[PDB]
Amino acid sequence: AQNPNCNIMIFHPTKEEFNDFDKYIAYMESQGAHRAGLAKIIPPKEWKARETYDNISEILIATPLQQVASGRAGVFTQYHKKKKAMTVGEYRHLANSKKYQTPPHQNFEDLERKYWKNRIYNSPIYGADISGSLFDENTKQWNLGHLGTIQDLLEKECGVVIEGVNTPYLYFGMWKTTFAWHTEDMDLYSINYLHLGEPKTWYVVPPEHGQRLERLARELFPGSSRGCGAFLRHKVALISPTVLKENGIPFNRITQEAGEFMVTFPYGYHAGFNHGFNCAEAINFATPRWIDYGKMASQCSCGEARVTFSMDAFVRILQPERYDLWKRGQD
Ligand SMILES: O=C(O)CNC(=O)C(=O)O
Ligand SMILES: [Mg+2]
Ligand code: NI
Ligand SMILES: [Zn+2]
């Protein structure tokens, strides 16, 4: 078995190898990359996502989210308070202000220590989940707005034809902005490109051990667990690496820098934080290997997780028993 310790793998495709996205994903899995839940892909040196970022300040963040924490430093939840709209130029100036900017630090490890010590005492503002793309239309390789759709994958593998569309999302971050522990909707893959700015640190649990993280989360967030049988779908819970190590949860960490892709694999729990002002683009995708994960994915029916139009069809076709109750939650 390849990659039996479930380490995060780093790939350096040539420009030739970067032509065929599907083929490269299958390659990475042939080497065991999926076992980690997360892989890094460094694009060939000849590739670029777009010519310059010189003109992005006019993008609107219609609903910036203030991420307010509750709990203790290593075990907390966050709620998202909606803020007034602002442009990316306005958000970047806020990120760089004395109140919100990255503190002085020695290296990524010192910064990680400071994040886990101090996160809960601040409320950074995250411009998350903005439909759009920063890839140039002329970028033909690994252009996250030109991928094969999940609906088309389901049609090719299973014959069934369904409604829905699959488009990318932009994320504008600042110091301490946080993504809570989650898997993707319907345990899909994700791919995330860091277009510019400061790094993003990721933590990940191997898919084969995801249920260990779930059991810990039920112990650490016991009221949330009684409220919903899949409350990590709410995307609000944080657990630090220290706490994971104290409880024997297998995990890995890696820091993504500007210009790099990350892929999350089906049922790979992940969480993390931004080091400073940045912009990422991400989208969900599927392969044939995902189908079985999609059939088995948990679902929030308490009603809180409230997800996309396109997820309806996935549930309806892959999980027809759950359909009914999942849609009672979503209506
Ligand atoms: O970048 C972020 O805030 C969160 N991204 C993801 O969870 C992802 O790409 O799957
Ligand atoms: Mg602009
Ligand atoms: Ni994700
Ligand atoms: Zn729920």
UniProtKB/Swiss-Prot annotation:
Post-translational modification: Ubiquitinated via 'Lys-63'-linked ubiquitin chains. Deubiquitinated by USP14 with the help of TRIM14 leading to stabilization.
Molecular function GO terms recorded: chromatin DNA binding; damaged DNA binding; histone demethylase activity; histone H3K9 demethylase activity; histone H3K9me2/H3K9me3 demethylase activity; metal ion binding
List of residues binding Zn(2+): C228, H234, C300, C302
Residues that hold Fe cation according to the record: H182, E184, H270
Domain of life: Eukaryota
Role according to the record: Histone demethylase that specifically demethylates 'Lys-9' of histone H3, thereby playing a central role in histone code. Does not demethylate histone H3 'Lys-4', H3 'Lys-27', H3 'Lys-36' nor H4 'Lys-20'. Demethylates both di- and trimethylated H3 'Lys-9' residue, while it has no activity on monomethylated residues. Demethylation of Lys residue generates formaldehyde and succinate.
Protein's name in the database: Lysine-specific demethylase 4D
Organism: Homo sapiens
Residue window of the full protein shown: 11 to 341 of 523
